[PDB]
């Protein structure tokens, strides 16, 4: 009946990255970029002959929500930060606003770059994704993120209504206590699976939103003593089965075939499918790999030898998954 709970908890200990509130180093790297933006902006706007825009920053992403993992060797940390500029959205092209930040981050690190949803700045061993918002007061009450690239057409340049506070609050409030800890462990486990079996360029946000909809705690409460034990292997099995169950074969007219697609809405504005950017072929590979992980989660629960159980898990979770010698 070989259990694997101790092995999962040790795996968790190895992969987890402390969130911003417990990570001096992350805060320091964060604050450095925010400082370089403030400093940078003074020059960019001295040129324009205009007073510098101010901004309010906030923590975003997994280091804000305590779902962060350590990258594998060669991999990069992803420091996500929002900045709310004291500007009215209706008065500015969003890409143009993003240009102020890239130019402010001209010299800092290996430079800065304007992505579709953020300005990203590169440094040795990490990047910082700055999501750029217009001021809700000056912009008629909504918080809108700057969407669009430099090369992007007109209909793809926009201020999209967002709700990062709402999203973070739903992730943190879904469960509590040791139930919530298991939720977070299972997101992390799957982000290492991602880093191990997917190429370095199943989104993090995808699995997070997915767990919000479909994660269920797996624990046993002894009827007599009320003593609780968690079963992380079982929690992943049910969660992964539930995701697989929600793939829909979706016809693509252009390719004249169907691909299995997992759709997962953000539980807050704008309720976009967080996986919409994955192509049909990437979704098909995502599904096969999910099925193979499910198969190993089941194999792991029916091995006499702890070695054989752990090995089956290590083939999917990678070489930081502990495999005790036979
Ligand atoms: N496709 C999307 N739709 C809506 N919001 C998103 C999307 N992608 C990212 N975000 C927002 O930006 C944040 C940072 O995105 P990122 O891709 O870094 O995910 P993350 O949660 O930090 O996970 P990871 O640990 O993989 O970095 C998310 O946590 C989410 O609030
Ligand atoms: N809705 C969102 N809210 C906040 N951040 C987001 C959102 N969507 C994406 N991001 C951020 O930007 C990063 C990548 O998303 P983006 O859509 O900008 O990629 P892209 O510019 O299309 O690049 P690629 O060429 O790789 O497709 C994520 O890691 C995340 O931090
Ligand atoms: Mg992130
Ligand atoms: Mg990011």
First to last CA, the chain: 15
* Ligand closest to CA 119: 2
Can you say how many angstroms the Cα of residue 276 is from the centroid of all Cα atoms in its chain? Answer: 15
Most informative mutation of 30, 166, 205, 277 for ligand 1 (most atoms within 8 A of CB) = 205
Q: Residue holding tokens 């309010």?
A: 56
Ligand nearest to the CA of 204: 1
> From the annotation, which residues make up the binding site?
60, 62, 78, 80, 115-118, 129, 133, 147, 149, 163, 191, 194, 205, 269, 272
Residue matched to tokens 């298991």: 182
Phi, psi of 112 (to 5 degrees): -135, 160
Is the CB of residue 204 below 6 angstroms from any atom belonging to ligand 1? Answer: yes
Q: How far apart are CA 182 and CA 26, in angstroms?
A: 24
* Pairwise CA distance, residues 121 & 118, whole Å: 10
Binding-site residue positions for GTP: 62, 116-118, 133, 191, 194, 272
What kind of experiment solved this structure?
Answer: X-ray
DSSP 106: S
The sign one gets for the Cα dihedral 271, 276, 277, 278 is positive
Identify the nearest ligand to the CA of 150 by its number: 2
Q: How far apart are CA 135 and CA 56, in angstroms?
A: 9
- Using the mean position of ligand 4's atoms as its centre, give its distance from the Cα of residue 58 in Å: 14
DSSP 3-state of 88 = coil
Contact 105, 119 (CB under 8 A): yes
For the Cβ of 232 lying below 6 angstroms from any atom of ligand 2, the answer is: no
SS3 letters for 192-239? HHHHHHCCCCCCHHHHHHHHHHHCCCCEEECCCCCCEEECHHHHHHHH
Burial of 62 (0-12, 13-18, 19+ CB in 10 A): buried
> Distance between CA atoms of 258 and 101, rounded to whole angstroms?
41
Structure resolution in Å? 2.2
Question: Domain residue spans in the chain?
Answer: 20-162, 168-317
Ligand 2 and 42: CB distance under 6 A: no
> What is the Cα–Cα distance from 83 to 92, expressed in whole angstroms?
16
Q: Could you please state the CATH topology (level 3) that the domain comprising 20-162 is classified under.
A: Beta Polymerase; domain 2 (3.30.460)
> Can you tell me which atom of ligand 2 is nearest the CA of 115?
21
Decide: 134 and 89 in contact? Cβ < 8 Å.
Answer: yes
Residues 6+ apart with CB under 8 A from 23: 17, 63
Name, in order, each residue with C-beta under 8 angstroms of 172's C-beta and a sequence gap of 6 or more. Answer: 65, 66, 180
Q: Is 156 in the pocket of ligand 2 (CB under 6 A)?
A: no
């Amino acid at each position: 009946m070989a259990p694997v709970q101790k092995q999962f908890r040790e795996f968790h200990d190895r992969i987890k990255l402390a969130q911003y509130d417990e990570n001096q180093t992350l805060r320091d790297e964060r604050d450095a970029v925010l400082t370089a933006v403030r400093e940078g902006l003074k020059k960019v706007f001295a040129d324009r002959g205009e007073a510098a825009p101010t901004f309010t920053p906030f923590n975003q992403g997994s280091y804000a929500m305590n779902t962060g993992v350590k990258p594998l060797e060669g991999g990069e940390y992803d420091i996500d930060v929002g900045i709310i500029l004291n500007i009215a959205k209706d008065d500015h092209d969003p890409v143009e606003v993003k240009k102020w930040i890239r130019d402010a981050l001209k010299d800092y690190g290996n430079g800065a770059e304007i992505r579709r949803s953020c300005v990203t700045v590169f440094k040795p061993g990490y990047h910082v994704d700055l999501a750029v918002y217009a001021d809700p007061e000056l912009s008629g009450g909504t918080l809108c993120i700057a969407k669009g690239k430099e090369n992007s057409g007109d209909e793809h340049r926009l201020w999209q209504i967002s709700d990062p506070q709402g999203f973070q609050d739903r992730i943190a409030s879904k469960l509590s206590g040791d139930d919530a800890a298991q939720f977070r462990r299972c997101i992390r486990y799957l982000k290492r699976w991602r880093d191990f079996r997917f190429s370095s360029d199943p989104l993090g946000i995808g699995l997070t939103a997915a767990a919000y909809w479909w994660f269920q705690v797996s624990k046993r409460t002894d009827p007599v003593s009320q003593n609780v034990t968690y079963d992380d292997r079982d929690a992943l099995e049910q969660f992964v089965q539930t995701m697989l169950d929600n793939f829909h074969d979706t016809w693509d007219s252009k390719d004249q075939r169907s691909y299995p697609r997992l759709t997962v809405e953000l539980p807050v504005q704008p309720y976009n499918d967080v996986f919409e950017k994955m192509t049909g072929m990437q979704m098909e590979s995502f599904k096969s790999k999910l099925q193979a992980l499910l198969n190993a989660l089941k194999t792991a629960k029916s091995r006499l030898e702890l070695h054989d159980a752990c090995k089956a898990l290590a083939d999917h979770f990678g070489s930081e998954f502990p495999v005790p010698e036979k």
